[PDB]
Amino acid sequence: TDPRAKWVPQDNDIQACDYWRHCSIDGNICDCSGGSLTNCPPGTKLATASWVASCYNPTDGQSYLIAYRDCCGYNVSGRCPCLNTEGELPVYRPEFANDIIWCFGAEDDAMTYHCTISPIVGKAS
């Protein structure tokens, strides 16, 4: 309810914007349009490159590197929109920048934004 209050992760509901892996997500949660936490919906194209962030997991007290890869080639889903920016840097540090449409590498050179997945790619500690 307080947009300006510090982000508080949970690890009980992936379709909510405070889910701990969504800590620097900008877009829509794929699980709300027939994808899953870490997979793209049918018909969409899976980007290979993305922005990243370290998100803290309240369950085990460790931080993990999330790769925010976009599912592309469809109009925006419009379901479960979220915008978080934990550790998000401006565009001149694109590796950590989340206004960018991270669709590069998707099949068929698809570049339109539909939704974002939140797979873990590493430990951040």
């Binding site: 009980n12 509901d13 889910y19 709300c32 994808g35 997979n39 109009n75």
Partner: protein, 375 residues
């Protein structure tokens, strides 16, 4: 426990087990009797969305993009879905392209993209029976309004536009055979249209079956498998036409509302005002109390009636402003109740009327519910 929480549990278990995330593109589950499609014409927006929903789980299992006022169809047998759609080279102006796309119903990938020459689609708020499959699933038929009434013939099997059929001043397309469909006419007759590979089609008419001042709604329910066409009027009188023989047979007319209800202001109202369940031979109709010229407003009630006797079987208080109804065509059917204003599909038990689950955030102005009759 919600879908999102089960999913968080599973993902937590995966991470505890040290199982790596390896992203891929999912496939939809197999089309079943409880899959429901919701089209969002988005209040006449240049681009639009269709939501593929698992009505049993109340979950979005996929989506299909379309252009300006597209017409969705679904193979009764679950083997494909398609739409007739319209795009422009610069968003909403420049060169117009009308086309049909066929999609694989599990990968949701387009398997045909077939251009319609000379921009022949009728651009109108979405009426399911303005674009229709033949019973064999081989042909798509679509209506052209202007410059003259006509019906387009699209060969889905050979993936090619075939031709336009000149037809009389009639509207809607109700296919009864691989080569025959019916339409409803200005004068209030029905036309039967039988067409070949070449030549004038063969066109015959029934008699005029309603008065000129009895208005038949834009959203009649039509069961191709039963060959039953269920046509409410603005007062809740119901015409029914039996087309199963390949020719039109008018059934005894029924009233969905009582004389007392009519005198007390009850009328049907909404978009997809009427549904028909084939196995149970039942009609569902969205009604409420309204002035006579508020016929497109949402309704808060559904009446259910036997199609043979006209006997009221139920009256459900829906608990939301409902614009559109439909039913699954399986044994204990779901009643789908779509709210354009809430952008939410409400999923009810058809027997009791009880609300079972809902799916929200279905675009900007969702209006059309479509189900396969897989039996």
């Amino acid at each position: 426990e919600t879908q999102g929480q089960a999913a968080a549990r599973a993902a937590a278990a995966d991470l505890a087990a040290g199982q790596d995330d390896e992203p891929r593109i999912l496939e939809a589950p197999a089309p079943d009797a409880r899959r429901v499609y919701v089209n969002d014409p988005a209040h006449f927006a240049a681009v639009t969305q269709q939501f593929v929903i698992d009505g049993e789980a109340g979950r979005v299992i996929g989506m299909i993009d379309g252009g300006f006022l597209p017409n969705p169809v679904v193979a009764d047998d679950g083997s494909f879905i398609a739409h007739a759609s319209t795009v422009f080279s610069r968003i909403a102006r420049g060169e117009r392209t009308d086309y049909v796309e066929v999609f694989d119903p599990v990968t949701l990938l387009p398997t045909a993209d077939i251009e319609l020459p000379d921009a022949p689609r009728f651009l109108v708020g979405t009426y399911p029976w303005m674009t229709s499959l033949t019973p064999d699933g081989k042909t798509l038929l679509f209506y052209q309004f202007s410059p003259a009434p006509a019906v387009g013939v699209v060969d889905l099997e050979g993936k090619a536009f075939k031709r336009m059929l000149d037809v009389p001043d009639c509207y809607h397309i109700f296919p009864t055979a691989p080569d025959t469909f019916f339409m409803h006419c200005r004068d209030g007759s029905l036309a039967k249209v039988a067409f070949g590979t070449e030549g004038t089609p063969e066109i015959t008419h029934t008699e005029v079956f309603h008065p000129e001042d009895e208005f038949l709604i834009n959203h009649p329910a039509y069961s191709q498998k039963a060959g039953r066409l269920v046509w409410p009027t603005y007062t809740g009188k119901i015409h029914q036409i039996d087309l199963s023989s390949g020719d039109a047979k008018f059934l005894p007319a029924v009233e969905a509302l009582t004389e007392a209800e009519r005198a007390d202001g009850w009328r049907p109202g909404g978009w997809q005002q009427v549904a028909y369940h084939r196995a149970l031979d039942r009609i569902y109709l969205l009604v409420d109390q309204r002035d006579e010229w508020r016929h497109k407003t949402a309704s808060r009630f559904v009446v259910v009636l036997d199609a043979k006797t006209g006997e009221r079987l139920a009256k459900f208080e829906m608990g939301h402003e409902i614009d559109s109804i439909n039913v699954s065509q399986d044994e204990k059917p779901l009643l789908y109740a779509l709210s354009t204003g809430d952008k939410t599909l409400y999923i009810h038990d058809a027997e009791s009327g009880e609300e079972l689950r809902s799916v929200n955030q279905l675009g900007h102005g969702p209006q059309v519910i479509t189900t396969a009759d897989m039996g």
